Amino acid sequence: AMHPRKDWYELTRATNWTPSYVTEEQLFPERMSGHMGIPLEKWESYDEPYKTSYPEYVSIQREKDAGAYSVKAALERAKIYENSDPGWISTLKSHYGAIAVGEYAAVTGEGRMARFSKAPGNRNMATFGMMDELRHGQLQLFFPHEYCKKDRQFDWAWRAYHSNEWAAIAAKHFFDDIITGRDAISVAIMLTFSFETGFTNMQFLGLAADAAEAGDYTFANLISSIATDESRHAQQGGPALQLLIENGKREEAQKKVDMAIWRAWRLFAVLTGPVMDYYTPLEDRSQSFKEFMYEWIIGQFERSLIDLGLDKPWYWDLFLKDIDELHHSYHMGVWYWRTTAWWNPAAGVTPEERDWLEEKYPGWNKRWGRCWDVITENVLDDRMDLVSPETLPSVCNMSQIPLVGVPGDDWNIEVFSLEHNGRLYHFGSEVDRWVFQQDPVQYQNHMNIVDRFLAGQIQPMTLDGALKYMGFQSIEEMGKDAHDFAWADKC
Amino acid sequence: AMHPRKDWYELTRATNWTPSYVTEEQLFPERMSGHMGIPLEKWESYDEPYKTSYPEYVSIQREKDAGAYSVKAALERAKIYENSDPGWISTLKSHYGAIAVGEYAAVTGEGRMARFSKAPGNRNMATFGMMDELRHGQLQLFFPHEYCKKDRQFDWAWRAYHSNEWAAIAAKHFFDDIITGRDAISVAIMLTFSFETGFTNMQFLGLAADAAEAGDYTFANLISSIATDESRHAQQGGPALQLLIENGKREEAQKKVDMAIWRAWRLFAVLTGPVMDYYTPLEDRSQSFKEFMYEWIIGQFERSLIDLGLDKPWYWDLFLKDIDELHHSYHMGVWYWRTTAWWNPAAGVTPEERDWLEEKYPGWNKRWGRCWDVITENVLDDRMDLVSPETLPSVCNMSQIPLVGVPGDDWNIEVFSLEHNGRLYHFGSEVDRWVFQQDPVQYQNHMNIVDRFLAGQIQPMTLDGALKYMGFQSIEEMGKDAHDFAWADKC
Amino acid sequence: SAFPVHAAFEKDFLVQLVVVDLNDSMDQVAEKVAYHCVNRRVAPREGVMRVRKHRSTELFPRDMTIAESGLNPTEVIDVVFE
Amino acid sequence: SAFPVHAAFEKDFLVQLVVVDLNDSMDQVAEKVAYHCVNRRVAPREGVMRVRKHRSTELFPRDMTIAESGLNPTEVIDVVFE
Amino acid sequence: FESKKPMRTWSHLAEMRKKPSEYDIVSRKLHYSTNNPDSPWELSPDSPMNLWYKQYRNASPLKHDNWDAFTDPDQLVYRTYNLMQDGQESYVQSLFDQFNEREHDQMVREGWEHTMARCYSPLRYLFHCLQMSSAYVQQMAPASTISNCCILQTADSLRWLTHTAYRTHELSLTYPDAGLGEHERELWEKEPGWQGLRELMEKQLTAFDWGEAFVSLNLVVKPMIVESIFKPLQQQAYENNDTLLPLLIDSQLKDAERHSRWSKALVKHALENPDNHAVIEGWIEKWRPLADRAAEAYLSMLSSD
Amino acid sequence: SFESKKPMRTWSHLAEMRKKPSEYDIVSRKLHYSTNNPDSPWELSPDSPMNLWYKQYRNASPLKHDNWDAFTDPDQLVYRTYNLMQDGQESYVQSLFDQFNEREHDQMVREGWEHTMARCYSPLRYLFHCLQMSSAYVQQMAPASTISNCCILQTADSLRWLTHTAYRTHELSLTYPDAGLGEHERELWEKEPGWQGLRELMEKQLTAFDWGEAFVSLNLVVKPMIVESIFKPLQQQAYENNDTLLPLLIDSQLKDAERHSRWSKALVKHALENPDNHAVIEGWIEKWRPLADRAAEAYLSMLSS
Amino acid sequence: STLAQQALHNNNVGPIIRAGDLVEPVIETAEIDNPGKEITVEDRRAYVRIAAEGELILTRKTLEEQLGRPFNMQELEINLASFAGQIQADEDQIRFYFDKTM
Amino acid sequence: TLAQQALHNNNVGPIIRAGDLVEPVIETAEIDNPGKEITVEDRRAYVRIAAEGELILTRKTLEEQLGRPFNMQELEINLASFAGQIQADEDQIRFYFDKTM
Ligand SMILES: [O-][O-]
Ligand SMILES: [O-][O-]
């Protein structure tokens, strides 16, 4: 006979003890552990609600990978790359470049917790979390690897995080702040709770729904399988949050969640926003970016936040307004500076698409539509010099993304600046400025790509010089319009 | 350490002994075993070239099924049923009805050898063969079962072999002749060698090629996985063949192969021929039926027959002529009597398809095209009572398929008749009459469906009565034109 | 009275069961076969339809009856033009 | 000498790096910013282009130079119309 | 002609109370050869195979008007059989690997290799008889749910055969002078302790009635092998410091208990017809003295010098 | 300016390999971008706390190599093949647990063995958890992804051993409820002399934050000591007390431990390509050897009493 | 902002099942195991969002019968891509629930 | 005519179903049969790989072309058919003909 897990599970997490040959603080130093002075005894009530055991883990994950790889193998000849819309291929390039090695970075966040969390249950679930992020990183290298021979841009599935390309810097700045650069309890709260029960669902399930509409079942099956792991190890954050609230640390827990959510929002607005409203072919848009946001972040994540005993963030109404506006301007920037991307942005402004954008965001044509009109006329007149930039955009000192606002009829743009220790910083939002002020030593001597440009670190100090600095190795890898402006035939 | 197969395999087939308490002939009776008087000791030299062992079998077959089912699950929303051309859906309905319970019957053919073959290696490989056909029967019931809720015609994946529908009778008459109705050595030669290295590849790999072109990867992946099993257990036939030749029985071996090949040919000209040249949409036709025949039957199977020491069958030149002509007439019969099928035949005679037909079969338009001219004109003039029959086709007493010839400008039709024991039989070729003469006791008192109609066993003695006798339980189950005659609007 | 035969009509693609009567002339037999072929799969044409045993060289006379023919039930006949 | 500013042009969607010179008049600054905006993403229009410190109410005099202005390198300015 | 809507499952399952299981969908009512009593197979009604099935299946004294309602209590399909056995067989292969690493065979009590050569290695003939016999019940049984249980029992018999072949060879590497892998056929044919078993199997393999084949094999022969061969070998191995054999037999006994489970479920299904009790008891009594003779001869050889 | 180039068959960093890149090469090599910038390992302020940590404890390690990324796992394991391998081994172990429980194995151990287990075996869950935490630290600090990947799998293996011990402690408690099994292990780990050498060693080893010293102390000192002085003596004692389950279980764990020794020795060989590293590693080995020897001595004393 | 208020002020809990063979069995199980709850289903083709107000239970026994093959509760993670509500899981069932009412 | 030519071939080799074994088997066929011309006919759902008279696939080369551990017995997962007689062992599979037409 076998004995049921409920009967022996407690022994697997009976692993705390009172150190005698070193101090408790030497064994769990605050800068790595983040226990906020809560003594060891209090961490033993931590109870992970989504349990697993080593025998079940290796058996179930063997079945998950067998499914993912069997589907990839059976569809190798489905002509997805050849028959897909170029904007869909661009979505794959940006996803794999932005995610794959960041997943491998998440191994280090989970490892931080496996060594330095004072909660024995957390250290075991973080060990499975380490394994899950290994899976995620290896899958999302293995899958795009077969396209290297079609397109040098898929090399950026591996190369992006090794580059100084501006969007790789934005992703690394975020993940190094939330995942690899903070103590174990911060990781539990900012990564597993805030990011992996919130925005990760936009990218791995919202995009899966678009992939299924587009007919890419290898990709949809892949990223939805990845999300099943996230659903288990993301449950490490809830009990840590509850522990901090019950030990007098509600304010600190709220601040970390507030910070983490906003940082993820700005990055996912530039990566997922353009994908869902512009790169994905119209007929394959299952919902708009805003409708997905209201499903996954407002309807699901924010409600779960309240259920755990936390409050709506202080920036709630700022966040709702950003949802209507930010990614439209991020899209325009990524497109206008497409030569700095490792994918080929789709402009996505044929009349058919402009009608859909107007229905999903009333007033779109009077705002971003005004810029796309000038761009469209220049393409129709063969003034291609007017649709490529000769300067760089100003970049947020927090998100590492260009400083944007609403263009056109009711133009409004605000930079939120900050003098700090003899340096002038510029931020794209109130909240980004606030995030900086919560932890200046984390950020104050970092230099964004434009800071480096003006400091002489980018030679020659030209757009061409920035492209060499960003790591581009051939003309083919620089981004171009996804359709080679064939959409202008529709205008 | 583990010891390699080539270190203990011989002992797995050291299982022959000299019986003492019953006689050798009681243990292995000729009517079940078919040893042709070849003594037990001679059968010990049987050496299966495609070996497996129980531990490897269960491990590898576990992996095969994991892939088959996970691909099916990942593609369930690919919209195959709703979006596929109806000709492709009819191909699925025809395949599953004709094959699924026929696979389960092949378990009995393998079981016949596992018990009654005098060769120990045959008895072991037939045990894995029993398991393989169990797999194939269960896969090909499980996969169509999900479409039951969409279309009653998918019920025939289970029901066909329980009916007296005319194509079901043709399939059972063939499979009961070569699989379930003969001794073990006949099974080895007629099923595993003749059928499972010959025509099986037409249905499971030729069709898979068309399935991949059509975008149905669940079905392509399934039937090509089934073919990997057949490749192993079909290798039981060669060693039995070689033993028969070494022991003076080449003439008997040649007769059995000649008979099984012709019987399989007639059946697959009616099931696979129309699928490949008419039902499959033109853009998905990887090769013509005849091109596939020259690849799989002439180029591969008949060359393998020569290599093992047998001769080209005596009817070689009749076969080659048949490949040019027979399935075009079988298609016309199935379509004109479409109400008697459990699938919906596609006419496949739009001008674009007719150009393809003429290119692949020069002279097609002056033969079958003459008949399709008359049909097409009636459809355009809404004289629909002339596109449905008011009598029965005459049916071959061997293949159970209608008696056909070449229509049009060089009309040629021949029936080969035979009086035997006060009964008049009619056959569709010289070879079918010859097959009957090789073993009259197998066939002589069988009554084909038209024999039954004329003898009073079908009541009422009407086309309606025959349809009900054939097992149709509702109007929705009987075949219609796949496209509801929308093809006529292109003529 | 009822007399089943298997009949192949000129330029058609198959043999069909057609029930005729023992006292039918060959001209009536021909019309009954043609009912199941002409304007369905075979174009109409001018000419006199004749009946013969399957692949025989001889034709049965136009006025000759099935009973007079010596045909047995379920034998195969052709219907062709002169 | 080189004097980098971050400049937001009226009706554009973003703030850009534009390097002007320490002795450029405000009129010269506005034209150097307009090179990266007008006829690229912003329609041309009639009127006089004015420069101001970002979000403030007062406009720099058109004849004033960057050196005479109060501006520091990398500060944010708006280029707007009257 | 009536109109009917599509059904959620096969026509013959559509009136079940519960939702059809995987097992129901892929296993039930597949023997079309039972539909026509005068013509099992679609051939001449007096074809040789049709006469065989009319005599040995249709005319069996064991009768039931719905054999097809029989249900494997384990509800095994091909997919779940391979899942189960890949686990059990990879367990046994890992045992072989590790006991080999420890050189288990060198530590057996002196002379155990001779007892293995005489009483264990010739089981490959006995197990192959069970394999052949199971395949016969498979092809003759009147319901596909019955036949399916026999298929897996045939595969299990070959699994046991393959265990015995592997261990015979492996043991011969430590003891090359015991006849292991060389003399099994002569012992099967001539050694007194085997002749009871060989006579039993040779006569059992010539019982062609499907019902008598099933009863003699699964209710008489196979229970005797568990009780008089498997378990006494386990006890002998314990006496002789063979710790591998009891673990291997424990895994084979799991197969044997599964065979016993579906066997008993079929009997219970059959006894819905009160006439079948005397028929089953009659065949049991007919075959039991042969099986007792076989057990007594084997056990006296097993416990000998 | 820029030049036109053709697509590559693999990643740019692998395109100069002589052979076709393996699955292992594709998914494991050169993934630590935190080694690219010496001033800012992470994309934050160069003197952020975690950047300072990595510059002190990774970049400034006296163990030096110009190409740590060239390291190769001799087993070339990836996540997929690790799970394939371990599902086989762990289902083997779970099948042993099942069958030995059916046999009532724990009831037949020599009298008093349950007290030896309560004292000397069940507190190993603390030691195994320290190996788990220590392996996770070497993972996050190692300067190459191929090294870190070996550490991830070693972290999972440590949890595997912990889980074995937890399972068996509870199961043993069911036959022997009056021995403190599953109740007193924390007190033994904290207070029993035989455990204080091991607990002193791990508490100190867990505070060695230099990645090289962490690796050397963990994999070249601690883990070999556990093999020689805990695993193998426990197998011997089990043999003397008629525990036949524990030697089989430990043989499965020793398979993991030899895999850890294999990649560890491979990294040492890689590091010795720089002649300066021999003195560095030998010095750390001599520094930690005395604590490891005292740990083993105290444990073995307790196992003997 | 009132559209955002009403999106936030929900009490929907339950599983998000990815495309595969578990979608329809989980929907049927949710209906059977929560009599007197209205079960809502939103189909996004790559996944299905299954919800009820306040609490939703899936029992292993019902899921096994609706799936049609032997099933362990831990296997649900092969297809549970996300979920709304807090989770309480064991060998017999999984419960999705909220502690507060909005 | 065309038929006699189709019959009188000596082409031998594996038919690999669509999946991750197609490209490694083609590469292996070329590497392990130097001096044979390898013919490949792609039917999307399967690939027909042939050489004249004999074609060898070795385990060592296949495992190298595939990029992961490989046993010869696993070839059956993707070997949907083959031309020629088959001689298989732990180290290689050989497809071959006894006669020369
Ligand atoms: O990041 O998962
Ligand atoms: O016949 O499979």
Ligand SMILES: [Fe+3]
């Ligand atoms: Fe992840």
Ligand SMILES: [Fe+3]
């Ligand atoms: Fe994650």
Ligand SMILES: [Fe+3]
């Ligand atoms: Fe088959």
Ligand SMILES: [Fe+3]
């Ligand atoms: Fe077969």
